[PDB]
Amino acid sequence: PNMKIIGNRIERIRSEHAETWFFDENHPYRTWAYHGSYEAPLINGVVRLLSKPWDVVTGVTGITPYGQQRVFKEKVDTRVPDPQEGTRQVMSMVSSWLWKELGKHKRPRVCTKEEFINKVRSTAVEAVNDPRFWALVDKEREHHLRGECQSCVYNMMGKRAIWYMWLGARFLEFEALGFLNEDHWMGRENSGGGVEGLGLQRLGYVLEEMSRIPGGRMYADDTAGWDTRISRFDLENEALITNQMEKGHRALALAIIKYTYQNKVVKVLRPAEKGKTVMDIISRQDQRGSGQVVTYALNTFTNLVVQLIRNMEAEEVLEMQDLWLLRRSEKVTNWLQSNGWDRLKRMAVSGDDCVVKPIDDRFAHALRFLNDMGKVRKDTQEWKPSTGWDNWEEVPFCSHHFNKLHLKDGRSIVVPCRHQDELIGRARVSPGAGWSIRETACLAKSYAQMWQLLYFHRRDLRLMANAICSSVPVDWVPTGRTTWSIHGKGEWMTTEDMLVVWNRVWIEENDHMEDKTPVTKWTDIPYLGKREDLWCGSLIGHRPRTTWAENIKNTVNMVRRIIGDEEKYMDYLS
Ligand SMILES: [Zn+2]
Ligand SMILES: [Zn+2]
């Protein structure tokens, strides 16, 4: 461990728990440095009541110190092996080229306290309105400008692993690197292959556009445990963005990168004897600390780099000898300057997910650089060629597939779809304990309106959404977080009529809809074919679902009585 960079944080934690601090020789950490330990100490009722048939669907009901330790042994206690020197030379060249393209029409900048407060306002609200929080933030920034870090420490939670950091550390990351998100550096117009800021209502059109580019099949390979495969070399290559920063901003960003990305200090819970719990203090110099302000943007960047490299190997620009040491590097510069933009426009990359439309199917067996970079494909033998898709409507991307549907008048739209159990299961989860009827119903309304905008083509979701919206007062504003996906843009977070929002999103503002004729009734908005709806998890035709549909108005009346019969309600079912 680099005690010169993490030592201050470990010593600070040790001094805060000095009387219970101890070194456990029987700790379970294999690839993380261990420093010591100390002693340490959910249903949305509205959605549940309106989704009775799914109480026995394991796909729905399925989705702590023991939990944190399980994710360590199953996923995070691993070390990605170093790529060879030539592979590292290619990764650095491609990353340098890509940063220069992304920065051609954009300038890095510091993000402000005002920008952060505005994003928070959408107990974090209490902290941003307290001057003592900003004083703690200022003390840590002063340490950073002096080459020190005292409190940027992760808190592991898990259940993929989720790494939490105190709001002030997240502010310092946002100040230095938030411009990647706020100024849309990974937007498609700026990056060619990125899709940041496109909603699920548009991603399908990107895949359809890619299908028309001449080339091989569409490949959408997943890397097994992407965040654990981000190496110290990937982090150094991502850090090249600091070369485009002015000196003051550069100092802030280098502190975030060096002290919190390239060196990390984490707190993890672990069960101990007699039902007691300990907190372990560990560290490491690689992996992506999933949950950072710029995890998505940096994962998108590095996945773009990986896919450009796999295309160069497929096109026989890179040879086997180049893994050991890159020979004739001008060939890589030429390929990037000549073909890089064309190959970026042949990709759709969102964090660790990608779809590539290579110039031919040599991409399927171009595995040497991919495997040497440790970006090993999930659910496939390491050296077996990839299998691509001939039909863009079957390609998985961002946990969805995309289907062309036809409106009653002959026009077509391209909609997002996924297996329905995950959609209902997520809506049935309420975040945090102590949620009242007002907060629970507003969050149920947000899921229901999101379904009306994006998944209206699924029979069960259109009906369940109409039942939820009929059970929650119409003047209640949808609240909470409907998804963690950057592609759920929140047009459904409104009291504007969802048929109006549907028309704005799918017709008026949809650049892929040439005819702007409005759709004036929900009965003119299509469903998937019954067999497609069933393939993706519908319960149509299943007796408990038929009973639920026939009883739905009774169920809505029951919920209205619970919330209060005096509220303003709208009948969305008739
Ligand atoms: Zn710090
Ligand atoms: Zn589907």
Buried b (16+ CB within 10 A) or exposed e, 137-159: beebbebbeeeebbbbbbbbbbe
Q: Which of 106, 29, 107, 111 is nearest to 73 (CA)?
A: 29
Question: Which positions ≥6 away from 153 have C-beta within 8 Å?
Answer: 9, 13, 165, 166, 169, 265, 266, 267
Measure the CA–CA gap between 254 and 362, rounded to whole angstroms.
39
Which ligand has an atom closest to residue 458 CA? 2
Which ligand sits closest to the CA of 394?
2
Residue pointed to by tokens 């292959």: 193
> Which residues is 412 bridged to in the sheet?
406
Q: Which ligand is nearest to the CA of 399?
A: 2
| 260 close to 149: Cβ distance less than 8 angstroms | yes
Write 502-508 long-range contacts (CB < 8 A, 24+). 502/452, 502/453, 502/456, 505/199, 505/201, 505/453, 506/201, 506/413
Long-range contacts of 79-82 (CB under 8 A, 24+ apart): 79/31, 79/286, 80/228, 80/229, 80/230, 80/231, 80/286, 80/287, 80/374, 81/374, 82/231, 82/233
How far apart are the CA of 44 and the centre of ligand 1, in A?
37
Residue whose pair of structure tokens reads 């209490």 in the numeric block: 126
How far apart (Å, rounded) are the C-alpha atoms in residues 356 and 215?
10
Give the number of whichever ligand sits closest to the CA of residue 403.
Answer: 2
Amino acid of residue 290: S
Give the angle 237-243-245 at the CA atoms, nearest 5°. Answer: 125
Considering every ligand atom shown, identify the ligand nearest to the alpha carbon of residue 204 and give its number: 2
**Please, how many CA atoms are within 13 Å of residue 30, restricted to the half-sphere of its CB?**
10
- Side chain identity at residue 386, one-letter code: S
CA of 528 to the centre of ligand 2 (A): 8
C-beta of residue 44 within 8 angstroms of C-beta of residue 130: no
- 3-state SS of 491-515? CCCCCCCHHHHHHHHHHHCCCCCCC
Q: Ligand 1 mean position to 139 CA, how many Å?
A: 10
Domain locations in the chain? 1-41+65-78+150-163+262-285, 42-64+399-574, 79-110+178-261+286-398, 111-149+164-177
Detail the residues annotated as belonging to a binding site for Zn(2+). Answer: 140, 144, 149, 152, 401, 417, 536
Q: C-alpha angle 205/208/212, rounded to 5°?
A: 140
Q: How far is the CA of 534 from the centre of ligand 2 (A)?
A: 9
Token code pair at residue 322:
């180049």
The 3-state DSSP class for residue 536 equals coil
- Host H or E run for residue 233: helix 232-238
Neighbours of 128 (CB within 10 A): 19
Residue 98, φ and ψ in degrees, nearest 5:
-65, -45
In angstroms, what is the span from residue 394 Cα to ligand 2's centroid?
Answer: 9
Q: Helix 247-256 to helix 167-177 angle, to the nearest 10 degrees? A: 140
Distance from residue 238's CA to the centre of ligand 1 (Å)? 19
Q: How far apart are CA 321 and CA 486, in angstroms?
A: 40
Rounded CA-CA distance 329/417 in Å is 43
Of 300, 293, 294, which is closest to residue 348 (Cα–Cα)? 300
Cα separation, 464 vs 451, whole angstroms:
9
For 49-88, b where at least 16 C-beta lie within 10 A, e where not — what string? bbbebbeebeebeeeebeebbebbeeebbeebeebbebbb
Beta strands 277-284 and 33-40, pairing class: antiparallel
Closest CA to 318 of 91, 83, 80: 91
Cα end-to-end span (Å), the chain? 65
Distance 71 CA to ligand 1 centre (A): 26
Helix, strand and coil percent figures for the chain, each rounded to 5? 50, 10, 40
CA distance 344 to 102: 12
Q: DSSP character for 83?
A: P
User: For 316-352, b where at least 16 C-beta lie within 10 A, e where not — what string?
Assistant: ebbeeebbeebeeeeebeebbeebbeebbbbbbbbbb
Residue pair 109/149 in contact (Cβ under 8 Å)? The answer is no
CA dist 490 and 477 (Å) reads: 12
Q: Give 401-425 as a 3 state SS string.
A: EEEEEECCCCCEEEEEECCHHHHHH
Are β-strands 264-271 and 277-284 bridged in parallel, bridged antiparallel, or unpaired? antiparallel
Among all ligands shown, which has an atom nearest to the Cα of 400?
Answer: 2
Tell me the sheet residues that pair with 353. 350
Hey, which bits of 69-188 come out as E strands?
Answer: 154-156, 163-165
Q: Please tell me what DSSP assigns to residue 73.
A: I
Identify the nearest ligand to the CA of 264 by its number.
Answer: 1
Q: How far are the Cα atoms of 35, 122, 171, 419, 516 from residue 116, in angstroms, in the given order?
A: 34, 11, 7, 35, 37
For residues 42 and 433, give the distance between their C-alpha atoms in angstroms, rounded to a whole number.
Answer: 6
Instruction: Compute, in angstroms, the gap from residue 23 CA to the centroid of ligand 2.
Output: 52
Q: How many other C-beta atoms lie within 10 A of the C-beta of residue 400?
A: 21
DSSP string, 365-377: G--HHHHHTT-PB
Distance 256 CA to ligand 1 centre (A): 7
Q: Tokens for 429?
A: 């989860």
Ligand nearest to the CA of 147: 1
Exposure string over 460-482, b if 16+ CB within 10 A, otherwise e: bbbbbbbbbbbbbbeebebbbeb
Please tell me the total number of residues recorded for the chain in this structure. Answer: 574
- Ligand 1 centroid vs 12 CA: distance in angstroms? 12
Grouping H, G, I as helix, E, B as strand and the rest as coil, residue 128 is: helix
Which residues have CB under 8 Å from 353's CB, separation 6+? 220, 222, 303, 397, 398
Report H helices in 327-458.
330-345, 368-372, 420-427, 437-454
Ligand 2 centroid to Cα of residue 418, in Å, is: 5
- 401 Cα: distance to centroid of ligand 2 (angstroms): 6
> Residue 495: what residue type?
T
Distance 97 CA to ligand 1 centre (A): 30
Say if strands 154-156 and 264-271 run parallel, antiparallel, or are unpaired: parallel
Question: What residue numbers does the annotated binding site cover?
Answer: 140, 144, 149, 152, 401, 417, 536
> In 72-130, which residue ranges form alpha helices assigned H by DSSP?
85-102, 113-120, 124-128
C-alpha dist (Å) from residue 551 to 242, 451, 463, 539, 559: 60, 21, 12, 15, 13
20 CA distance to ligand 1 centroid (A)? 24
Radius of gyration of the chain (CA): 25
